[PDB]
Design a protein around this nucleic acid. Structure first.
Ligand SMILES: [Cl-]
Ligand SMILES: [Cl-]
Ligand SMILES: [K+]
Ligand SMILES: [Mg+2]
Ligand SMILES: [Mg+2]
Ligand SMILES: [Mg+2]
Ligand SMILES: [Mg+2]
Ligand SMILES: [Mg+2]
Ligand SMILES: [Mg+2]
Ligand SMILES: [Mg+2]
Ligand SMILES: [Mg+2]
Ligand SMILES: [Mg+2]
Ligand SMILES: [Mg+2]
Ligand code: NA
Ligand code: NA
Ligand code: NA
Ligand code: NA
Ligand code: NA
Ligand code: NA
Ligand code: NA
Ligand code: NA
Ligand code: NA
Ligand code: NA
Ligand code: NA
Ligand code: NA
Ligand SMILES: [Sr+2]
Ligand SMILES: [Sr+2]
Ligand SMILES: [Sr+2]
Ligand SMILES: [Sr+2]
Ligand SMILES: [Sr+2]
Ligand SMILES: [Sr+2]
Ligand SMILES: [Sr+2]
Ligand SMILES: [Sr+2]
Ligand SMILES: [Sr+2]
Ligand SMILES: [Sr+2]
Lengths: 56, 65, 46, 81, 194
RNA sequence: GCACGGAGGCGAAGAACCAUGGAUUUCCGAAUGAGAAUCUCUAACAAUUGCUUCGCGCAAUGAGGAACCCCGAGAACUGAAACAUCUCAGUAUCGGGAGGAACAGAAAACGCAAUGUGAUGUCGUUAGUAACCGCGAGUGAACGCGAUACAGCCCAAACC
RNA sequence: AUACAGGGUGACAACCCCGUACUCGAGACCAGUACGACGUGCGGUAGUGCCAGAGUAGCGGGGGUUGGAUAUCCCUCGCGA
RNA sequence: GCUUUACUGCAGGCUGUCGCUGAG
């Protein structure tokens, strides 16, 4: 069984969903954590300096 | 339009509420006739009713009812 | 699947948005919905 | 403050319910319960509500099918709006 | 004549001798069974507390905090490092324990602001410090000529920015001349070389 | 309104429009009665604190903000024509935190050694100087001076 | 023309329109600052070992850091006026 | 990437010592 096309047919699990806090489809319904804004993980909003060029 | 601010302030608290229910009913019937796709409409009033109700509500707050 | 009431509201909105730009807007602007979606070719969120 | 009854739902299927089952159909606030729909209707048209069935529609609104008592006549009630 | 306070002071110059020695031996047994931050109604070292600004008044709080003794509790590198950056054992943190103590105390009382702190001994595995905290929102303090200054907005969370007496010492701000070229006005403005 | 349509309406009861102030302001959201992919279940400052009439009665904290700022944690590619000290660099990145600016600040200073200067930032200079360094590559101040702006005070104790 | 900045208007516009010079008005910041006023009360002599901040000053072991070299700053363990 | 009695270091284990730490 190839890792490619044939293995793609087994994918019918819902993980990432519309996030209550930020509105992005990043709320992982299994972990109950938003990979985009951090909801469910932290009160503070998920943010990182590497999201932009260092001097900008 | 038809209803002015003066007229509203000149009404007693009970009159505003009565006028309120009356306006709401005209609106409800408008939306009903609109729901039935009715044509005997006058697009202006359906818009006027909303504002009139906002005016009365604003006045009721100002006066304390 | 099983849709919650909120999911339902969202699907409903997406359906509504998925309509043509009214004919009269054409005239008024003297001459296209960029958010037109197809159930099959596209994929909504959630 | 949100009202209960939004507007009459007028469609062929609705007309039939009205002509054959003495039922009226309304678009109501999605937060309204079967009971709150029953009251609102009795207090707006002065009639006796016997049963209420609801449905959250794919149009984002809640639809109510309100059956009136035999003492009332839907056809006539709806005819005054 | 000598103040009664001078006696508390003099006793604490040698916490390992006399009555004090016996007191500590007794007290520590209880402290060891207490939490990380215990509010106390009265300073163990009155003279020291009053000297640092303590007052028997509403809005003035004292809490004892214990912290594990020793160097940095650091995790060894999980990626490539030149020999110089592979150390783990002899590496120590840049903030002294008294400072870590003041911060834990201040976290416990989010609405209060650190005024000062002092040492109350240690055993072989931990150190204890008492921290004086003030309520910037209480009128008895808002009206105090000696403490109201701590009610200003720019004093909020003062401990976390090193504005404490222990904070300023640890930042190398004691000296006004030689040796403070890289500490004043801040470690950061001086490129972090102090 | 964008938006140059159709219909209809509003405006001399002075509309539109602008300024200031006020009203309304769904749900989720620090999100705070409990739970939940923005909904649901049966009165709510949840949680941590201060005061306390010891009752959430009165209060505080939480999260956001372009960067700037303060306190902590802290690389490597790279340079040395290899490389380990050194360098890149206290840089990137991470944790915490304040403000409109931060931080510093009225000498247990300086040490043009003096019959002299007189809180502190910062700018120009002192200077790639002193100092560091497989004394290699490289790293690198300060006092002073010219400026900017200037401001000096409060406790602990003694005695009550 | 104290206005010949700029723009608009069916083509190269000081004089067609908006503006522009001059003069004037309001808000914000400077700033609850400066000045002014209220209260407080500066200072000096003689006598008096009454008072004046401790794990500190200082030393040693181990680290980091720094231009700091014997002579940087800091952490940690021990000792200590 | 991997190896080892390559170079240099780092964890870790063993061991002495100091603190915790007292009385006869
Ligand atoms: Cl604080
Ligand atoms: Cl000089
Ligand atoms: K390197
Ligand atoms: Mg359709
Ligand atoms: Mg159902
Ligand atoms: Mg006084
Ligand atoms: Mg600065
Ligand atoms: Mg909630
Ligand atoms: Mg090289
Ligand atoms: Mg270095
Ligand atoms: Mg070489
Ligand atoms: Mg350097
Ligand atoms: Mg110097
Ligand atoms: Na699809
Ligand atoms: Na509707
Ligand atoms: Na605090
Ligand atoms: Na609003
Ligand atoms: Na609160
Ligand atoms: Na309470
Ligand atoms: Na090279
Ligand atoms: Na190489
Ligand atoms: Na070197
Ligand atoms: Na240093
Ligand atoms: Na040492
Ligand atoms: Na390889
Ligand atoms: Sr197989
Ligand atoms: Sr296959
Ligand atoms: Sr599957
Ligand atoms: Sr979590
Ligand atoms: Sr962040
Ligand atoms: Sr497909
Ligand atoms: Sr539909
Ligand atoms: Sr805070
Ligand atoms: Sr001056
Ligand atoms: Sr002194």
């Amino acid at each position: 069984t190839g890792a490619g096309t044939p293995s793609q047919g087994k994918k019918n699990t819902t993980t990432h969903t519309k996030c209550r806090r930020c509105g992005e489809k990043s709320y992982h319904t299994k972990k109950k954590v938003c990979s985009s804004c951090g909801f469910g993980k932290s009160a503070k909003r998920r943010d990182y300096e590497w999201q932009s060029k260092a001097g900008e | 339009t038809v209803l002015h601010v003066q007229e509203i302030r000149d009404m007693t608290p009970a009159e505003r509420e009565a006028e309120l229910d009356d306006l709401k009913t005209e609106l409800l019937n408008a939306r009903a006739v609109q729901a039935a796709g009715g044509a005997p409409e006058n697009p202006g009033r359906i818009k006027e009713l909303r504002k009139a109700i906002a005016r009365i509500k604003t006045i009721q707050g100002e006066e304390g009812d | 699947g099983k849709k919650s009431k909120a999911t339902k509201k969202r699907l409903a909105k997406l359906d509504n948005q998925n309509s043509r730009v009214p004919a009269w807007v054409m005239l008024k602007t003297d001459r296209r919905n960029h958010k037109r979606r197809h159930w099959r070719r596209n994929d909504t969120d959630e | 403050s949100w009202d209960v009854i939004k507007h009459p739902h007028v469609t062929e299927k609705a007309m039939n319910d009205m002509d054959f089952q003495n039922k009226l159909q309304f678009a109501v606030d999605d937060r309204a319960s079967k009971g709150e729909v029953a009251d609102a209707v009795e207090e707006q048209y002065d009639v006796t509500v016997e049963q209420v069935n609801t449905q959250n529609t794919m149009d984002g609104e809640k639809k109510a099918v309100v059956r009136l008592s035999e003492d009332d006549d839907a056809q006539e009630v709806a005819s005054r709006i | 004549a000598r103040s009664a306070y001078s006696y508390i002071r003099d006793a604490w110059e040698n916490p390992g001798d006399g009555q004090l020695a016996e007191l500590q031996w007794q007290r520590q047994q209880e402290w060891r069974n207490e939490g990380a931050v215990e509010r106390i109604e009265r300073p163990t070292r009155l003279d020291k507390a009053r000297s640092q600004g303590y007052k028997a008044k509403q809005g003035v709080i004292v809490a004892r905090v214990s912290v594990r003794k020793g160097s940095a509790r650091k995790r060894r590198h999980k990626a490539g490092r030149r020999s110089k950056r592979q150390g783990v054992t002899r590496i120590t943190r840049r903030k002294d324990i008294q400072r870590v103590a003041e911060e834990r105390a201040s976290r416990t009382f989010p609405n209060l602001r650190v005024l000062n702190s002092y040492s109350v001994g240690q055993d072989g595995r931990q150190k204890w410090h008492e921290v004086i905290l003030i309520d910037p929102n209480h009128p008895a303090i808002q009206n105090d000529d000696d403490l109201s200054w701590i009610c200003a907005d720019d004093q909020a969370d003062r401990v976390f920015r090193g504005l404490t007496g222990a904070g300023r010492r640890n930042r190398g701000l004691s000296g006004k001349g030689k040796g403070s070229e890289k500490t004043r006005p801040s470690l950061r403005s001086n490129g972090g070389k102090a």
